[PDB]
Design a protein around this ligand. Sequence first.
Ligand code: CHL
Ligand code: CHL
Ligand code: CHL
Ligand code: CLA
Ligand SMILES: CCCCCCCCCCCCCCCCCC(=O)OC[C@H](CO[C@@H]1O[C@H](CO)[C@H](O)[C@H](O)[C@H]1O)OC(=O)CCCCCCCCCCCCCCCCC
Ligand SMILES: CC1=C[C@H](O)CC(C)(C)[C@H]1/C=C/C(C)=C/C=C/C(C)=C/C=C/C=C(C)/C=C/C=C(C)/C=C/C1=C(C)C[C@H](O)CC1(C)C
Lengths: 219, 220, 238
Amino acid sequence: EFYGPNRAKWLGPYSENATPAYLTGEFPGDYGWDTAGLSADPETFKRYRELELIHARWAMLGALGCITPELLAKSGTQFGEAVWFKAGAQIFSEGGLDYLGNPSLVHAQNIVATLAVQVILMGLVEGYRVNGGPAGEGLDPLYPGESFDPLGLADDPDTFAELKVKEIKNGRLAMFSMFGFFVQAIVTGKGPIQNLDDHLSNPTVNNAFAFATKFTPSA
Amino acid sequence: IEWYGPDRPKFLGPFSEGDTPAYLTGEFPGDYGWDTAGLSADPETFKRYRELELIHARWAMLGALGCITPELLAKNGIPFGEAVWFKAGAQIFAEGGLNYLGNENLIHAQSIIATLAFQVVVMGLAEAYRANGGPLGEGLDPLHPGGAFDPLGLADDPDTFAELKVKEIKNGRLAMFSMFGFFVQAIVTGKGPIQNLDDHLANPTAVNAFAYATKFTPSA
Amino acid sequence: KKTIREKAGWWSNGGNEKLSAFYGPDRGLWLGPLSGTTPAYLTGEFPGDYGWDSAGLSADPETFKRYRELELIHARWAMLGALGCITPELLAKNGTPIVEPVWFKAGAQIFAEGGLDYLGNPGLVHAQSILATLAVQVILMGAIEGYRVNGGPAGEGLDKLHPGGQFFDPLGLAEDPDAFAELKVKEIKNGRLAMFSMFGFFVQAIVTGKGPLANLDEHLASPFTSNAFTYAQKFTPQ
Ligand code: CHL
Ligand code: CHL
Ligand code: CHL
Ligand code: CLA
Ligand SMILES: CCCCCCCCCCCCCCCCCC(=O)OC[C@H](CO[C@@H]1O[C@H](CO)[C@H](O)[C@H](O)[C@H]1O)OC(=O)CCCCCCCCCCCCCCCCC
Ligand SMILES: CC1=C[C@H](O)CC(C)(C)[C@H]1/C=C/C(C)=C/C=C/C(C)=C/C=C/C=C(C)/C=C/C=C(C)/C=C/C1=C(C)C[C@H](O)CC1(C)C
């Protein structure tokens, strides 16, 4: 499974004609879901694959960077502010942005200098993604290797393709989780592990349907 | 009127002879020559987009019906608690629950989880049979099956089947545009669209949309 | 090899490398030297080709020419907007009595007592009803925007984006081939700048609620306290 014409598909047993003919099983996670036909052209398919994997890895990094201060708030450190949709306000505090609640570790003051250093590093490392650099030169722009794999888990090509489909499946689940974090931050106003604590406190009232009313206009 | 071929009724009339796309011939129902955005150049994107348009159309038709017939039907008789459509989901949380005709002996709907779970389970196989296969037919036209969907059989002659297709897509595009209107004129008034209709008919000059134009201006 | 006055560009007759940096494969790109693989369909024969189709929406050439049309029309509309958004505020800071010179509250001027005074003057436009204004707008704009796609009284068989006949190039700046090809990429770069600035006008009106020239003055007075980050706490979900 997971590659070829007899692979795992998005409808499963009901997925023998709805899958498009141009989604042949060579690329990872090709579950055959192009119901709007946007990746019919091969250049659109390649660019959307690049966008999907980069969005995937940014989403899983964002998922861990959002939930790990919540798990450490469960663990016992206080940081500057644990809530991820209130985490940017640590640099607006009086003590600044302490990293792990340690005032002698980051202690950031200027948000403008943070954005300047952030864009000066990120523009360089995002432009290095396109056309090689100190890490690589002319590799696969989605799977470079040889400088970002110090352990090098890409040795056997069958296990390499297995890790590819595992990565893209964890990535679709990660963008799913980050979209959930986005639309349950705005309707609840509490952190996501805190929403897990509400849903584990009473599972039948602390749902999305407790807050399913608040977005009516009402003049 | 022809609704097909090169001399079809187009979306700009006289202003539609240089705009008209070369990939958009007089084949499919409702082709007024409107692809100014350029999103139907390859025919399988056009196939998925025609499928998307017809499914959105056939959903927005019943959406407009389920919008206005509670409010109109409450205007005639049969009173409800929340007769408007966009508070209609809140009737589950009522002390008497959502009822179909409002009377207490029909359904007694207090749970939102059971209804959502049941409709997800049945529409999984329903929309999966819509995608492909199914006990009512597998390899038919996926947009226009017929067979076990036509008890009356109005698709007999290809001419009246074609004109039924074009009036289907025209009523559906009208329903999608009007459902967009329902969506936006719910949120700028907070009041029902039939009640918006009586508010417009009471004062056409100053109870129109422009009375709610200064509503969405940002503060501070 | 080359003397000092040629390096400054004194002589505008021997400039043939002017279109070499905006057309052809040896042109400037979007990430500069950090953009190696230019998309193979963006060959640089069109104005504004910085090799940027990262989402890949313009791989097909028909979609690409429709997107070029949409880009130039949005560019000219946003250019007229970004000129027509700040200039009421500029003339209010001049001293011309425009009563609501911010662009995001100028539509509500027609719901005032005295209607819509144009330059703050009743001798001007003095339009009262929004209904007849929108009616003559949709009639005039229907006629003009329907003349746009397939020709009309100001040109019939001309180009759909650059007609340039006796009505749309009356001053005659685009008579020369190289000057027209240079001012095409000048037009689309000024239009992309104004599209970005109109998006900035939209977001600045949404999250601040003040004037864009008021935003410019509140950034000129305090740059480090009154940045975009002091309004970053305005959409916190409670
Ligand atoms: C056999 C039954 C079966 C069916 C019917 C489906 C179909 C589905 N699979 Mg699935 N699969 C099935 C089995 C299997 N799948 C997979 C592998 C996968 C993968 C990898 C993926 C899927 C995904 C999906 C979903 C894609 C369609 C969609 O996005 O929903 C469209 C319909 C809705 C969203 C309706 C939602 C229900 C409800 C009405 C919502 C409530 C509405 C709100 C109240 C309205 C909002 C209000 C206002 C404010 C906006 C859908 C649930 C994809 C997915 O998860 O996307 C989300 C996906 O990535 N499947 C395997 C392994 C081989 C299966 C095994 O048999
Ligand atoms: C010759 C004159 C003629 C004119 C002017 C039009 C006009 C139009 N027809 Mg057409 N038609 C015409 C002839 C004919 N039409 C049709 C049958 C159809 C159909 C079936 C359809 C059209 C549609 C259209 C529209 C397509 C272009 C567009 O999207 O505008 C874009 C520009 C605008 C919409 C601007 C107008 C709105 C307003 C002035 C601006 C709003 C400003 C807001 C305040 C800003 C919003 C606030 C922000 C914050 C959100 C356009 C409005 C399509 C349509 O209805 O799309 C909606 C459509 O489906 N026509 C027939 C029968 C064969 C014609 C016969 O000659
Ligand atoms: C070699 C270095 C170099 C770098 C790093 C860039 C960078 C860029 N150029 Mg380029 N250029 C570079 C060389 C050159 N450029 C140009 C000429 C141009 C032009 C004409 C254009 C560009 C554009 C771009 C952008 C294209 C990608 C994009 O849209 O990012 C978008 C993503 C980001 C910028 C990152 C996100 C911002 C922020 C850091 C994170 C979010 C912060 C918030 C706090 C989040 C909160 C929000 C919440 C609420 C959701 C990108 C910023 C285009 C542009 O301006 O697009 C905007 C464009 O039109 N360049 C020339 C002349 C030939 C160059 C010569 O070397
Ligand atoms: C075709 C279906 C349809 C119908 C029957 C109506 C009918 C109505 N709408 Mg709805 N509306 C529609 C589509 C529709 N609209 C669409 C597609 C949108 C999205 C742009 C809206 C957005 C909208 C808002 C935001 C509001 C209304 C309101 C109203 C009511 C007053 C009319 C008004 O203010 O004009 C609004 C009309 C539009 C924005 C465009 C509708 C398209 C029409 C059919 C074309 C114009 C033809 C017209 C007769 C000639 C105008 C001449 C001149 C003024 C230009 C009226 C009951 C207002 C209300 O609730 O009143 C109390 C209100 O607040 N509507
Ligand atoms: C080959 C033909 C070329 C023709 C070119 C076009 C010429 C256009 C002339 C101006 C026409 C504007 C009139 C608009 C309708 C107004 C109706 C009305 O009620 O008026 C009312 C107005 C008076 O109204 C007053 O308006 C003022 C404006 O600030 C004040 O607000 C006063 O309070 C108010 O009372 O009457 C006039 O202004 C008529 C004057 C017309 C002549 C103005 C001088 C122009 C002379 C040189 C022309 C140069 C031509 C080339 C430049 C244009 C190139 C495109
Ligand atoms: C390139 C690329 C590439 C890759 O690959 C992909 C991607 C990313 C997708 C792409 C991108 C894209 C983009 C960026 C877009 C954007 C756009 C915009 C911003 C526009 C604006 C736009 C804007 C606009 C139009 C504007 C306009 C304006 C107007 C009309 C006017 C207005 C006004 C004025 C005067 C003032 C008054 O008081 C009123 C009003 C009326 C208000």
